Amino acid sequence: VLGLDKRALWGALPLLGFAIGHFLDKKETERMTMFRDKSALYGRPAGSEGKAPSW
């Protein structure tokens, strides 16, 4: 049994901050796209770039 009364509707703002931080983490993942497949450990050689990116 939860104990969240009508004052728990204020808590949408920290979840909005969670969404803002998650969006900024996704944008920083998009920013670091150099060496996405060019690394020597997980990178396939040339001629196989037609597939989808890993992340």
């Binding site: 060496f35 996405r36 690394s39």
Partner: protein, 62 residues
Amino acid sequence: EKSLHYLYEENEKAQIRLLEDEVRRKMSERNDYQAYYYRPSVAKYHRISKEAADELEALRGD
């Protein structure tokens, strides 16, 4: 690979910071460039006073 990208960016930033440290040290050692360590001295006021004394030679008389 995000660690690889951030390490490449931070290593290039460290290399450029070291290079600009040597560039600033050699610039401040010899005072060569006009930008950072140059203490500007002008001969504008000496030329202005010499020009004014040159015009005052023509106005001497009666």
